[PDB]
Structure formats: C-alpha cells, structure tokens
Write a protein that binds this ligand. Structure first.
Ligand SMILES: Nc1ncnc2c1ncn2[C@@H]1O[C@H](COP(=O)(O)OP(=O)(O)O)[C@@H](O)[C@H]1O
Ligand SMILES: Nc1ncnc2c1ncn2[C@@H]1O[C@H](COP(=O)(O)OP(=O)(O)O)[C@@H](O)[C@H]1O
Ligand SMILES: [Mg+2]
Ligand SMILES: [Mg+2]
Lengths: 160, 371, 74, 118, 371
C-alpha cells in the first residue's frame, strides 16, 4: 500500500527527472491526459532490466486501485523503482532461525499443513479455501508433506 | 534413562532403544573409501562413506566389511561404524545411555576386551554389557529351553539351553554363513556367463541370493527336474538392464548349508551339527531339545528351510521323539528383540558393568563375574 | 586420553577454582557480611548454570536441526 | 492467484512470530527467575554464634564446589555442542554453495555493449 | 583482481574475464603471411595478420592454423596469437591477471609444459592453471555427473564423470572433428564441379558447412529421397556471385561423424564410442551416465544431431534404461562458460600454480599436485 509510497519518497527529483525523461515518450501526445499503462511494458525496459510479465501485470493491476486506468506519475515512479531492489533487509538469519524454531513449536524439525494453519490462525487473518493449498505449494517445495528449513527459508526469503 | 540395545552383527548393524518391537535403524556395516581421482572441486567429497550412504555411491567406492567372522579385524573402521550409529542414525549422545552389545560364542578374548575398552574410553558410556547372541534369540521366542541355531551372516553357532542353564560343552560353532553362500553363488554364476568380480558387485550377487534362492526339500529330485523342464528359471534385472536367468543355481547356492563340502569345508551341514550338539547333552533333556529346536538369524530365511531341516533331523533322530522347528516370522531381528526384552528387565538392572568397576579392574573385567 | 587427561584437567580446574577458605576466625560482623556475599555468589552461580542449561538445550535443538537439514539433503 | 495478499500474509505472520518470540523470551526469563529463587534458598543468620557461622560457611563452600563442578560439566557440553554446530554449519554451507554457486554469474554485463564497435 | 579465462581451442580462440556469461572476444586462430610481392610503397603492409584481421584480407594471404589436433605444432605462431589476444582483443596487460588455459585430454606432456613455460616467461603472468576441456563443459551444465562428448574442431573426446570423480580409464579420444568434416565436404563438392583448393577457400567451404549441412535422422531414407525429389537442393551465393546448389552433400558431410569409414578412419562413430565409454565404467553408475549424456563443443551444433544420437544410443543400450541427451542452446561457448564459473569459485582460489612454485620446480610443476 502506501508503504511503497514512503519507499519511493526516499528518491528526490534526482531520479524524478530521469523518470520524466523516460515517461515523455509514454506521453507521446494525442491523449486526454489519462495516461494508460500501455507503454509500461517497454518503459520498464528503458534501461534493459525488466521483471516477469506476471510481475508486470501484478504491478499494473495493483496500482490505480480506483480502476481509472490513469497512471499517476507517483504511481509510475514507485512501479519503476519497484524494478530497483527495495527490501527491508529481510530480518536477520539468526532472527529467521529463531522464527522457524518458534514455528517448529512441535520441535519436530518440520511443519505440516496443521502447524502453519495454526500459526496463521493465531494471527486471526481471514484465509480462503482457495488459499492453504497455495500455501501447501509454497511451503512443501519438496512435495514431501512438510515444511523444512530450506523450504521455510525460501518461503521467508528476504521478506520484511 | 533408557538403554541402547546395539547389535554389531556382521553384515547389518541393528540398533534401537530398549523396550520397542523393532530396531530403529538397520543399515549395512560397510566403510568404503573412494578409489578414483576426482576432478570436480568443491563437491564436498568425504573420505569415507559408511553405513547406508555407501550402498548408494557404491559405484565408485571399495566397500570393505570391518567384521570378518564374528571377530573384528579392523578396529578403526569399527569405531567409525559405532560413531555413525550413535550420532547419525539414533542422534543420542552415548554419555547418557547404557549399551548392550552382542557377541558370538567362542570368540577371541581380545576382541571383547577391546570392544569394552573402546565403549568406555572413546564413547564414554555409563555402563555396557556383552551378551551371547543365542541367549537373546531364545529370549525372543518366549521359551526357557531349546537349542537355538543362529545362522547369521558371519558365523553359524548352535547353543543348547535347558531350564535356563546353558551347556557350555555342547556349543558347536561353524564358520559357514551367509557371506560364504554369497561367494559361492558368485562363483557358480560364472557357469552361465555372468562374471561379478568387483567388491561392489558382491552386493548385487547378495541381492540375487536374497530374492531368488530357496532351499530344496530333496536335492537330487530338484537337480533332475531342473535339468529336464524349465519351470524353475527365474529372471532378474540387473541395476542397468540385461536381465539374467538363474537355472538350477537357485537351490544349489543355499544347499551349501547342508553339504559344506561344496565350498571345500570338511564339517557336516547345519542339519547334522544340531543333532551332534543335542547328542552331547545329557540323556534326560534330549526330548525337550528335540521338541524346541529354534531357528534364528538372517540366513535361516530361505523359503523352505524349516521343512528340509525337520526332514533331515527326523531322519537322524530316533523314530519316537517328536521333532519341531520353531521358525518365527520375525527371524531376522530375533536377536535384537531378545536384547530389548533382556535390557527391559528389572532383575537384570544390576548386572551392567558400571564404569567405576572398569576403572578399578581394567578391561579384563568382562571375563569376571559381570560376564 | 580422558583416562587421566580429562580427569586431571578437570581436577586442576577445580583446584584452581577454589579460592582462599579462611574466614570464621574473624569478628562476627564482617564474617556475616562475607557469608551473605558468598550466598549471593552461589545464587548467581545457580542462575548462570540454569542459563547454561537453557543455552545447551537450544544448541542441542540446533544440532538436531542441523542433523535434520543434512539428512534432508537425501 | 493473488501474490500481494500472500506478501501481506507473509509479513503479518513475521510480525506475529516476532511478538510470540518476544513473549516467549519474557516467559522464559520469568521462569528462570522463579526457578532460581526456588532452588537457591536464602538464609538469614543474624545474632548467631560463630559455630553456626562455621557450619553455614562450610556448607556454602561445598555448594560452591559442586556448582562449579556442574558448570564445568555443562560448559564442556556447550563447547562440544558449539564445535558440532560450527562443523555442521560449515558442511551445510558447503552443500548450499555447491548447489548454488554454479548458477551465479554476471550475465550480459558487456555482451550488449557490442553494437557497432566492430 | 579478476582472472583471465582464455581457451585456446583449435579454430576459434575464446577469451574473456572470469564471471561473465559470454567470451569477450571470439576470433579465428589463423596467422597468415602475405604471399604475393606488393608494389605500393608506404601502404603500411605488415608481415603477418592474425586473428579476425586475416579473415578479411584472406584473398592475398596463406592462412595456416597453429594448432593441428589439440596439440600445438608451431610455437611461434601460437605465441603471436596469445600476444594478440592479450593486448588487442582484451587490452589488459598479463602482468596483473591470472590465466586459466584449457587442454584436451590425453595430449602430449611437452605441449602442456611448453604452454606453462611460455605463460610464465614471455607474458609473465602471476599464476596460471590448466584444466581439461570436458570438466568445464560439465560445470556449465550445472550437473555433477554425466558423460560429456566435447566434439570440438580439432579433436573429439568423451570424458565420463560420476559424482565429481573422473574415471581416467574410460576416456575415449577420437581425432575426427570439424576440420576433417570441412576437408571431406571440400572433397565431395568436387562431384558437382565446384573445386576449392586454396587455403583461403577452405574458409568458404567451412561457411557452406555451417550454414547448410544438417545431420539426417535416418541415412538411407534421406539418400533415397534426395535421389528422387529435389526438395533438398539449397543454393548458396559465393563471395563473388555464381550461386551453387548443394544436393545430397548436405547430410553426407556430417554423416562422417557416425561412420568414420567415409574418410578412411577405422574407428566407430561418435554414437558408438559413447556407448563403449559408458560400458567401461562400473556396473552401478551406468544408469546415471545414460540419463545425463551431455553434448558440447562447436561441431555438435548440426541441426538434428541430438535426435540421431539419441536414436543410435537407444538402439545400442538396454531397453529399460532411459536415454537423455542434454543439448543446451549455448553449446559453442559451454566450455568457456564453465571455465568462468570455475575461475569464479572461492574454493578454487588456492589451486593456481603460483609463480614462486614454478621458480622452485621448473615447468614440470604442471604434472604435479597442481594439476
Ligand atoms: N530374506 C532373505 N533371504 C535370504 N537370505 C537373507 C535374507 N535376508 C538376509 N539374508 C542373508 O542374511 C544376511 C544378514 O544376516 P544378519 O542376521 O543380518 O547377520 P547378523 O547376525 O550379522 O545380523 C545377509 O547377508 C543375507 O545374505
Ligand atoms: N553453427 C554451426 N553449425 C555447424 N558447425 C559449426 C557451427 N559453428 C561452428 N561449427 C564448427 O565447429 C568449429 C568450431 O568449434 P569450436 O567449438 O570453436 O572448437 P574449439 O573447441 O577449438 O573452440 C568450426 O570449425 C565449425 O566447423
Ligand atoms: Mg546375528
Ligand atoms: Mg573446445
């Protein structure tokens, strides 16, 4: 949400001028000022580095939550710097190990579906039936019916 | 705390905590150094793969068993095997657990003394006790009498027991066992064209022996039948294809047990050393030993041995006595189940060789009252 | 090799561990003060020993975790 | 398949785990203090004869020796455990490096630089 | 600092700094002196054009490769090629960069020793290391097992590797490669009227081979089809016009790989030397080698070879094993990518042959522990 508004707030006009120079081709004229996301596919390719098309669509549909199809220069700025690396260092490896140890409250060295289910139920967050199986794929990377240290580390890979 | 019932054996190390039904970790006892050069850097190549890990990388190793015939011939490798067993297959430090090793009858003293010295100095256990491999197999059957034939993979020994009183003058230990049968099978397979030479291919021949061989009820009739029909030829797929067909090698490999003249051994088969072991006993306990003949050990798992042995003994024994052969389905782990039962007893809890006792009398304590 | 090596090592460690023991031959007040000090010393010793127990438990759990991970390679 | 919501769940569970670890450490500290008070009895010895002083002192000396002995034992245990932790951590790191470093490289760093220099 | 991953090869020298994806400079390894007289004064005519410069003035030069079959036959020209590679194509003085050459298996020792002596005395590098051209190609695939067939332009060699342990007794080196295919194509083109003789026109025949030839899935059916229809005849424009039409010469040139009897060589094709190299390995790692057959080198870029080879091996191999042929799209530079990966490793950083070590033991240090 507005978390990435604060994240993009760090860069001042120093990158804003470059972003506007890149975006000027996006506003190639004969437009009513709506500024869709049509050129964004190559706009994210302005310097060469471009993420997955799935992530491109995620960024496209994620912003402009009103559905206006209008690209705010702030929205374009935060989405293009989203191509730049932006993470809060993903906690600490010792910290993550302690987190998984707490996760492995059964002390079994593994987390099944029920362990993670209770872990997130303690949060009280609403989780769909369409989920869980998604979490099953995300966690059981080995398809071994449990969550391992490598699987947890990938699951929590640099997430903060 | 709980006791560790280890059972060194020769061919498969079986271990687990006392009081369960089956050993927790069963894995071959082989230590194989790599033999080729190795060009990939940083692959994390170790210097010796032990246990079940060396049965998967056996293509580039030279596996060598550290226990030849009951006795231990390579103490460093045996120490490595024990260290692996304690730390990686059970993950329990030995500083907090009594141990109950097992040893074949009539073994050299130095082997047993070195075993106890290792267990007390290197692994530093609280207390260890060494037991004869046949008394445990008699425990597991729930009997208290009977003559047990424990045909392992290293050595076949035949300990008669009556009313709990072992008869030390009637133990007949014979050194033919599963390993010699593997070598003989590997030697007779060459009569069809299949040559297995490498120490890794001995494992393949062992698998062939386990899955295909069986003991014939009557040897000459089977030899005549296999030479006329072709109803016996069973095929088997090597680890790379090229299926092989075993003909009358099927029942000729385990026949060596009843005719040790095949591999050049002089002694009589396992069908006649049991009768000799009985006849050395007193005249009044022979009926009970006849009726309670017990089989144990891995090599007695051949399909059809409990009938061949009964037929042979009935031929030898007097016609009036009843001959019965106890062959429980859990034959392979019979010794370890008996070991668990013995370690779980309350009456046995004061027979352990406590460490302070070893400190006062040295390793020669094992031959003393604490047997 | 832990038959005399470890035993003598820990014996020496205990011997040097013990400090001076010459007290009760003095006036009552300072003796009481120092006895209270040594009770507090034993108290901190017990607290630290419990901390060592908990750290050992956590490190044993971590060793189980590392063994588990290295077994997960196969 | 939503991914932003999955990221929300990930971060939120991370925060929940942080709070749970905090409360668990707090409970651990409370239990440690309670057990310490439980095991080490406090003694009051006001207005007592020197003989009782000698008895209390000698008992305290013996308890000091015993506690230092237990501390030596658990310290040896912890040193061995730390040695094993370091060794196994190195081994797992080597395994991960073997699995991953062959996949690390600098792709297209100068390959795209060759447009019309030739 | 960064390491220089040079790769001499035979036909194309590929070089670049360690840690990238592709070699920085790739250029043919030919040194051609002018052969005519020369009448213009002051034109600035040099005495030897090397590298890619002599592929543009090849009309009046006599190009001659300094590397015949892996081995180096003309040391002065090879020194000239190395000097060009360091100073003009990379522009980095060798005094400040380690080097990682590559060498075919089973090559003469003197070649390797002279190579290290040159690198240490003339160019005066800090440290150099020589690696076998197949292990690198196995690095690039991200595997750790597999049998790699590295059919370069000089020599085709087939090194099997398991779990990082190379098998030195199973390396099958065959001297048929891209150059012999170029000569055979130049020899069969004469059946239509086109005669290429000059050493400059060998380059034109090489271009024809690269752009038109392909490996037939089934040889006899293609020979029958090309002799009836005309759907195969593809035309090509020479460097001066006069287009030519290649008929069934298209799949007959690269067929020599699978039937070396075409150019009079006795040995078996690349489809059968791989199976022989596998069968020399132990019986327990043959499945893994069957499943991880790796292709590399330039000459394995013919359209349709990864299917012909798989069909042939499946015909030879037992029916149960799965045959899989890894043919990455970046085949040509596979060896160099692997070289970059190996030079970028931290574990490898202490295997270089440091100069002080060479000063103490002479050029024969390369055969020693620092391989
Ligand atoms: N199912 C089986 N059929 C035939 N032979 C077997 C079978 N299982 C094991 N064996 C033989 O028994 C041996 C294992 O015997 P075991 O009882 O483990 O010896 P030990 O007394 O040393 O433990 C193997 O080497 C194998 O040759
Ligand atoms: N696209 C291609 N199609 C067919 N053959 C090729 C192709 N590219 C290169 N070759 C052949 O491979 C040779 C280059 O092989 P290369 O891998 O450079 O040898 P080296 O191992 O010496 O580097 C050339 O001589 C050419 O005959
Ligand atoms: Mg046994
Ligand atoms: Mg090459």
């Amino acid at each position: 949400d507005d978390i990435y508004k604060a994240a993009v707030e760090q860069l001042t006009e120093e990158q804003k001028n470059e972003f506007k120079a890149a975006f000027d081709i996006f506003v190639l004229g004969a437009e009513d000022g709506c500024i869709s996301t049509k050129e964004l596919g190559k706009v994210m390719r302005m310097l060469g580095q471009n993420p997955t098309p799935e992530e491109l669509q995620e960024m496209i549909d994620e912003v402009d939550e009103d559905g206006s199809g209008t690209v705010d220069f702030d929205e374009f700025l935060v989405m293009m710097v989203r191509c730049m690396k932006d993470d809060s260092k993903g906690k600490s490896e010792e910290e993550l190990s302690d987190l998984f140890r707490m996760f492995d409250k059964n002390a079994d060295g593994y987390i099944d579906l029920d362990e993670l289910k209770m872990m997130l139920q303690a949060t009280g967050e609403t989780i769909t039936e369409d989920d869980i199986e998604e979490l099953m794929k995300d966690g059981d990377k080995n398809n071994d019916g449990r969550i391992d240290y490598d699987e947890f580390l990938e699951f929590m890979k640099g997430v903060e | 705390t709980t006791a560790l019932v280890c059972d060194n054996g020769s061919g498969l190390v079986k271990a687990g905590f006392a009081g369960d039904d089956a050993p927790r970790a069963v894995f071959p006892s082989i230590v194989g150094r790599p033999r080729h050069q190795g060009v990939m850097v940083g692959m994390g190549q170790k210097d010796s793969y032990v246990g079940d890990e060396a049965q998967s990388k056996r293509g580039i190793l030279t596996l060598k068993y550290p226990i030849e015939h009951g006795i231990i011939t390579n103490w460093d490798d045996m120490e490595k095997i024990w260290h692996h067993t304690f730390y990686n297959e059970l993950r329990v430090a030995p500083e907090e657990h009594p141990t109950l090793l097992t040893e074949a009858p009539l073994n050299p003293k130095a082997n047993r003394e070195k075993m106890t010295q290792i267990m007390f100095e290197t692994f530093n256990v609280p207390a260890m006790y060494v037991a004869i491999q046949a008394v445990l197999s008699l425990y597991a059957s729930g009997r208290t009498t009977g003559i047990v034939l424990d045909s392992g993979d290293g050595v076949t020994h035949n300990v008669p027991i009556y009313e709990g009183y072992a008869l030390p003058h009637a133990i007949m230990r014979l050194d033919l066992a599963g390993r010699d049968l593997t070598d003989y099978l590997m030697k007779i397979l060459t009569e069809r064209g299949y040559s297995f030479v490498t120490t890794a291919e001995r494992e393949i021949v062992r698998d062939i022996k386990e899955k295909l061989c069986y003991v014939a009820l009557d040897f000459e009739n089977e030899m005549a039948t296999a030479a006329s029909s072709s109803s016996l030829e069973k095929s088997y797929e090597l680890p790379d294809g090229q299926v092989i067909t075993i003909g009358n090698e099927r029942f000729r490999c385990p026949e060596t047990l009843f005719q040790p003249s095949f591999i050049g051994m002089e002694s009589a088969g396992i069908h006649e050393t049991t009768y000799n072991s009985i006849m050395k006993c007193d005249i009044d306990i022979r009926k009970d030993l006849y009726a309670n003949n017990v089989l144990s050990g891995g090599t007695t798992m051949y399909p059809g041995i409990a009938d061949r042995m009964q037929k042979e003994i009935t031929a030898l024994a007097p016609s009036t006595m009843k001959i019965k052969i106890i062959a429980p389905p859990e034959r392979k782990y019979s010794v370890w189940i008996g070991g668990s039962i013995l370690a779980s007893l309350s009456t046995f809890q004061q027979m352990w060789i406590s460490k302070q006792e070893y400190d006062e009398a040295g390793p020669s304590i094992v031959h003393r009252k604490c047997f | 090799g832990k038959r005399q090596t470890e035993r003598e090592k820990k014996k020496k460690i205990l011997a040097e561990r013990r400090k001076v023991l010459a007290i009760d031959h003095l006036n009552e007040d300072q003796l009481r003060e120092k006895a209270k000090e040594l009770w507090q010393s034993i108290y901190n010793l017990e607290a630290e020993k419990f901390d060592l127990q908990e750290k050992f438990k956590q490190q044993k759990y971590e060793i189980n975790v590392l063994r588990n991970r290295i077994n997960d390679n196969q | 398949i939503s991914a932003s919501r999955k990221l929300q769940l990930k971060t939120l569970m991370l925060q929940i785990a942080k709070q749970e670890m905090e409360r668990e450490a707090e409970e651990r500290r409370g239990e440690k203090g309670r057990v310490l008070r439980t095991r080490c009895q406090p003694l009051e010895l006001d207005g007592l004869g020197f003989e009782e002083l000698q008895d209390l002192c000698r008992q305290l000396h013996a308890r000091v020796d015993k506690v230092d002995e237990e501390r030596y034992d658990v310290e040896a245990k912890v040193t061995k455990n730390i040695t094993e932790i370091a060794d196994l951590t190195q081994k797992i790191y080597d395994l991960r490096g073997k699995f991953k470093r062959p996949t690390l490289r600098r792709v297209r760093i100068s390959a795209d630089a060759m447009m019309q220099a030739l």
